[PDB]
Design a protein around this motif. Structure first.
Motif, PDB file in Angstrom:
ATOM      1  N   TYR A  35     -43.469 -56.176  -1.508  1.00 34.88           N
ATOM      2  CA  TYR A  35     -43.076 -55.718  -2.828  1.00 34.88           C
ATOM      3  C   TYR A  35     -42.955 -54.189  -2.845  1.00 34.88           C
ATOM      4  O   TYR A  35     -43.712 -53.495  -3.534  1.00 34.88           O
ATOM      5  N   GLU A  69     -38.241 -71.953   5.849  1.00 38.12           N
ATOM      6  CA  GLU A  69     -39.119 -71.030   5.109  1.00 38.12           C
ATOM      7  C   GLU A  69     -39.357 -71.552   3.716  1.00 38.12           C
ATOM      8  O   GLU A  69     -38.606 -72.387   3.213  1.00 38.12           O
ATOM      9  N   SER A  70     -40.419 -71.044   3.091  1.00 38.03           N
ATOM     10  CA  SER A  70     -40.747 -71.410   1.724  1.00 38.03           C
ATOM     11  C   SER A  70     -41.605 -70.318   1.122  1.00 38.03           C
ATOM     12  O   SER A  70     -42.145 -69.478   1.823  1.00 38.03           O
ATOM     13  N   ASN A  71     -41.757 -70.355  -0.188  1.00 40.45           N
ATOM     14  CA  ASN A  71     -42.645 -69.422  -0.823  1.00 40.45           C
ATOM     15  C   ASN A  71     -44.028 -70.022  -0.996  1.00 40.45           C
ATOM     16  O   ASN A  71     -44.157 -71.239  -1.241  1.00 40.45           O
ATOM     17  N   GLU A  84     -49.879 -64.148 -10.753  1.00 38.74           N
ATOM     18  CA  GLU A  84     -49.369 -64.933  -9.631  1.00 38.74           C
ATOM     19  C   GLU A  84     -48.200 -64.204  -8.995  1.00 38.74           C
ATOM     20  O   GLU A  84     -47.300 -63.728  -9.684  1.00 38.74           O
ATOM     21  N   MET A  85     -48.208 -64.133  -7.676  1.00 37.47           N
ATOM     22  CA  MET A  85     -47.138 -63.457  -6.942  1.00 37.47           C
ATOM     23  C   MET A  85     -46.742 -64.379  -5.791  1.00 37.47           C
ATOM     24  O   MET A  85     -47.613 -64.986  -5.161  1.00 37.47           O
ATOM     25  N   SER A  86     -45.442 -64.497  -5.512  1.00 31.88           N
ATOM     26  CA  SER A  86     -44.999 -65.393  -4.413  1.00 31.88           C
ATOM     27  C   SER A  86     -44.691 -64.586  -3.173  1.00 31.88           C
ATOM     28  O   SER A  86     -44.272 -63.405  -3.276  1.00 31.88           O
ATOM     29  N   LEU A 120     -43.036 -64.961   0.959  1.00 36.66           N
ATOM     30  CA  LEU A 120     -42.301 -65.785   1.911  1.00 36.66           C
ATOM     31  C   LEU A 120     -43.170 -66.156   3.128  1.00 36.66           C
ATOM     32  O   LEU A 120     -43.823 -65.310   3.780  1.00 36.66           O
TER      33      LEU A 120
HETATM   34  C1  LIG Z   1     -38.844 -67.596  -3.087  1.00 39.76           C
HETATM   35  O1  LIG Z   1     -38.959 -67.218  -4.478  1.00 39.76           O
HETATM   36  C2  LIG Z   1     -37.980 -66.271  -4.911  1.00 39.76           C
HETATM   37  C3  LIG Z   1     -38.277 -65.989  -6.374  1.00 39.76           C
HETATM   38  O2  LIG Z   1     -39.634 -65.596  -6.545  1.00 39.76           O
HETATM   39  C4  LIG Z   1     -39.943 -65.301  -7.930  1.00 39.76           C
HETATM   40  O3  LIG Z   1     -39.310 -64.106  -8.339  1.00 39.76           O
HETATM   41  C5  LIG Z   1     -39.768 -62.905  -7.623  1.00 39.76           C
HETATM   42  C6  LIG Z   1     -38.931 -61.730  -8.105  1.00 39.76           C
HETATM   43  C7  LIG Z   1     -41.293 -62.686  -7.784  1.00 39.76           C
HETATM   44  O4  LIG Z   1     -41.613 -62.437  -9.159  1.00 39.76           O
HETATM   45  C8  LIG Z   1     -42.047 -63.944  -7.329  1.00 39.76           C
HETATM   46  O5  LIG Z   1     -43.489 -63.685  -7.564  1.00 39.76           O
HETATM   47  C9  LIG Z   1     -41.482 -65.178  -8.123  1.00 39.76           C
HETATM   48  O6  LIG Z   1     -42.184 -66.391  -7.822  1.00 39.76           O
HETATM   49  C10 LIG Z   1     -36.562 -66.785  -4.670  1.00 39.76           C
HETATM   50  O7  LIG Z   1     -35.758 -65.627  -4.860  1.00 39.76           O
HETATM   51  C11 LIG Z   1     -34.355 -65.863  -4.977  1.00 39.76           C
HETATM   52  O8  LIG Z   1     -33.792 -65.548  -3.764  1.00 39.76           O
HETATM   53  C12 LIG Z   1     -32.397 -65.847  -3.690  1.00 39.76           C
HETATM   54  C13 LIG Z   1     -31.991 -65.599  -2.258  1.00 39.76           C
HETATM   55  O9  LIG Z   1     -32.698 -66.466  -1.383  1.00 39.76           O
HETATM   56  C14 LIG Z   1     -31.647 -64.968  -4.692  1.00 39.76           C
HETATM   57  O10 LIG Z   1     -30.275 -65.351  -4.715  1.00 39.76           O
HETATM   58  C15 LIG Z   1     -29.458 -64.295  -4.172  1.00 39.76           C
HETATM   59  O11 LIG Z   1     -29.386 -63.106  -4.948  1.00 39.76           O
HETATM   60  C16 LIG Z   1     -28.702 -62.032  -4.252  1.00 39.76           C
HETATM   61  C17 LIG Z   1     -28.823 -60.764  -5.066  1.00 39.76           C
HETATM   62  O12 LIG Z   1     -30.224 -60.498  -5.176  1.00 39.76           O
HETATM   63  C18 LIG Z   1     -30.517 -59.537  -6.207  1.00 39.76           C
HETATM   64  O13 LIG Z   1     -29.950 -59.945  -7.434  1.00 39.76           O
HETATM   65  C19 LIG Z   1     -30.531 -61.155  -8.035  1.00 39.76           C
HETATM   66  C20 LIG Z   1     -29.908 -61.298  -9.388  1.00 39.76           C
HETATM   67  O14 LIG Z   1     -28.683 -62.016  -9.244  1.00 39.76           O
HETATM   68  C21 LIG Z   1     -32.069 -61.042  -8.099  1.00 39.76           C
HETATM   69  O15 LIG Z   1     -32.616 -62.257  -8.595  1.00 39.76           O
HETATM   70  C22 LIG Z   1     -32.616 -60.735  -6.698  1.00 39.76           C
HETATM   71  O16 LIG Z   1     -34.052 -60.770  -6.672  1.00 39.76           O
HETATM   72  C23 LIG Z   1     -32.051 -59.402  -6.253  1.00 39.76           C
HETATM   73  O17 LIG Z   1     -32.511 -58.437  -7.226  1.00 39.76           O
HETATM   74  C24 LIG Z   1     -27.249 -62.458  -4.000  1.00 39.76           C
HETATM   75  O18 LIG Z   1     -26.581 -61.452  -3.239  1.00 39.76           O
HETATM   76  C25 LIG Z   1     -27.229 -63.803  -3.247  1.00 39.76           C
HETATM   77  O19 LIG Z   1     -25.905 -64.265  -3.103  1.00 39.76           O
HETATM   78  C26 LIG Z   1     -25.499 -64.169  -1.732  1.00 39.76           C
HETATM   79  O20 LIG Z   1     -26.221 -65.048  -0.885  1.00 39.76           O
HETATM   80  C27 LIG Z   1     -26.052 -66.475  -1.175  1.00 39.76           C
HETATM   81  C28 LIG Z   1     -26.886 -67.265  -0.178  1.00 39.76           C
HETATM   82  O21 LIG Z   1     -28.269 -67.080  -0.516  1.00 39.76           O
HETATM   83  C29 LIG Z   1     -24.544 -66.822  -1.170  1.00 39.76           C
HETATM   84  O22 LIG Z   1     -24.342 -68.189  -1.509  1.00 39.76           O
HETATM   85  C30 LIG Z   1     -23.861 -65.915  -2.194  1.00 39.76           C
HETATM   86  O23 LIG Z   1     -22.505 -66.285  -2.387  1.00 39.76           O
HETATM   87  C31 LIG Z   1     -24.020 -64.471  -1.744  1.00 39.76           C
HETATM   88  O24 LIG Z   1     -23.475 -64.401  -0.430  1.00 39.76           O
HETATM   89  C32 LIG Z   1     -28.085 -64.860  -3.937  1.00 39.76           C
HETATM   90  O25 LIG Z   1     -27.464 -65.153  -5.194  1.00 39.76           O
HETATM   91  C33 LIG Z   1     -32.229 -65.122  -6.092  1.00 39.76           C
HETATM   92  O26 LIG Z   1     -31.644 -64.141  -6.939  1.00 39.76           O
HETATM   93  C34 LIG Z   1     -33.750 -64.965  -6.067  1.00 39.76           C
HETATM   94  N1  LIG Z   1     -34.330 -65.278  -7.367  1.00 39.76           N
HETATM   95  C35 LIG Z   1     -35.145 -64.451  -8.033  1.00 39.76           C
HETATM   96  C36 LIG Z   1     -35.680 -64.962  -9.337  1.00 39.76           C
HETATM   97  O27 LIG Z   1     -35.436 -63.343  -7.603  1.00 39.76           O
HETATM   98  C37 LIG Z   1     -36.364 -67.352  -3.259  1.00 39.76           C
HETATM   99  O28 LIG Z   1     -35.162 -68.107  -3.180  1.00 39.76           O
HETATM  100  C38 LIG Z   1     -37.504 -68.288  -2.874  1.00 39.76           C
HETATM  101  N2  LIG Z   1     -37.353 -68.746  -1.486  1.00 39.76           N
HETATM  102  C39 LIG Z   1     -37.454 -70.029  -1.128  1.00 39.76           C
HETATM  103  C40 LIG Z   1     -37.302 -70.317   0.343  1.00 39.76           C
HETATM  104  O29 LIG Z   1     -37.673 -70.915  -1.937  1.00 39.76           O
END
Ligand SMILES: *[C@@H]1O[C@H](CO[C@@H]2O[C@@H](C)[C@@H](O)[C@@H](O)[C@@H]2O)[C@@H](O[C@@H]2O[C@H](CO)[C@@H](O[C@@H]3O[C@H](CO[C@H]4O[C@H](CO)[C@@H](O)[C@H](O)[C@@H]4O)[C@@H](O)[C@H](O[C@H]4O[C@H](CO)[C@@H](O)[C@H](O)[C@@H]4O)[C@@H]3O)[C@H](O)[C@H]2NC(C)=O)[C@H](O)[C@H]1NC(C)=O
Ligand SMILES: *[C@@H]1O[C@H](CO[C@@H]2O[C@@H](C)[C@@H](O)[C@@H](O)[C@@H]2O)[C@@H](O[C@@H]2O[C@H](CO)[C@@H](O[C@@H]3O[C@H](CO[C@H]4O[C@H](CO)[C@@H](O)[C@H](O)[C@@H]4O)[C@@H](O)[C@H](O[C@H]4O[C@H](CO)[C@@H](O)[C@H](O)[C@@H]4O)[C@@H]3O)[C@H](O)[C@H]2NC(C)=O)[C@H](O)[C@H]1NC(C)=O
Lengths: 95, 95
Positions: free
Chosen positions: A27, A61-63, A81-83, A85
């Motif tokens: 973070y 992978e997973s959170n 709570e914080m997640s 990878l």
């Molecule tokens: C693990 O959990 C993650 C969420 O965790 C929660 O939120 C975080 C911030 C903490 O508070 C934690 O304590 C919480 O529990 C979850 O995160 C998700 O990750 C995916 C990628 O794997 C994100 O999608 C991609 O976003 C990027 C851009 O990222 C920024 O912008 C978005 C807003 O749109 C934010 O949400 C991000 O955090 C960043 O600030 C895009 O560029 C990307 O698109 C590209 O890649 C995909 C393939 O992945 C292609 O299909 C596209 O076409 C592009 O090429 C994705 O859209 C998602 O935003 C993010 N969510 C959150 C809420 O942050 C993660 O997935 C979990 N991992 C697993 C394995 O479960």
């Protein structure tokens, strides 16, 4: 006394190992809170592949969500709570 | 689902963690053999102290002996015993 070769070889081979990670590495945009604990135990791929052509990489992978104390200096502490990878599966794949 | 704070806090706190070390980092003067496995699992201190004034350091160490394969390219392979330093106990001590 002596760890047998098969045991050494299996235990060293690429897999998810419990790894202690600083929370700010995960973070790095946090600018408001101190965390306790300052590091967390996460399963991350590590170990060897015994082949210069291969590297140990995650294949699944997973959170994981953990309760972490966030401290705002002299203003209070709260459990949130914080997640993080984690790597569930690892393999030796061609570089 | 969620790892409770007490569990996170205890698991992250300074102690010997199984750590994968390249054998050449431990035997950097080796110039004749390749080793298999190329890395070994050793208990080494790690984790956090939650106090910028303290560092996690070993307070008791010992050697562990493991069977390791030494390979001389195209001349043969043999299992030999090699010792590695491990940390048995760790503490958070003033820097
Ligand atoms: C693990 O959990 C993650 C969420 O965790 C929660 O939120 C975080 C911030 C903490 O508070 C934690 O304590 C919480 O529990 C979850 O995160 C998700 O990750 C995916 C990628 O794997 C994100 O999608 C991609 O976003 C990027 C851009 O990222 C920024 O912008 C978005 C807003 O749109 C934010 O949400 C991000 O955090 C960043 O600030 C895009 O560029 C990307 O698109 C590209 O890649 C995909 C393939 O992945 C292609 O299909 C596209 O076409 C592009 O090429 C994705 O859209 C998602 O935003 C993010 N969510 C959150 C809420 O942050 C993660 O997935 C979990 N991992 C697993 C394995 O479960
Ligand atoms: C763990 O096992 C170590 C031995 O392991 C075996 O041998 C190695 C090479 C591998 O083959 C392995 O697979 C084997 O199982 C054992 O090593 C011993 O370590 C001590 C230090 O802890 C050494 O004593 C100190 O030697 C240095 C100089 O080091 C060089 O010269 C000597 C020859 O004299 C070599 O033997 C070394 O390897 C180096 O090439 C001295 O400067 C030092 O004196 C100073 O420090 C002491 C305090 O330690 C003071 O009292 C003195 O007055 C000086 O201030 C020591 O004399 C010892 O040489 C070394 N033995 C061997 C065979 O290498 C290690 O102790 C084991 N650890 C534990 C926790 O059991």
């Amino acid at each position: 006394e002596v760890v047998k070769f098969m045991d050494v070889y299996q235990r060293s081979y690429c897999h998810p190992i419990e790894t202690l990670v600083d929370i700010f590495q995960e973070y790095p945009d946090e600018i408001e809170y101190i965390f306790k604990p300052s590091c967390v135990p996460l399963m991350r791929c590590g170990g060897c592949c015994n082949d210069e052509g291969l590297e140990c990489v995650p294949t699944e992978e997973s959170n994981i969500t953990m309760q972490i104390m966030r401290i705002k200096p002299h203003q209070g502490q709260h459990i949130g709570e914080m997640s993080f990878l984690q790597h569930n599966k690892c393999e030796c794949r061609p570089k």
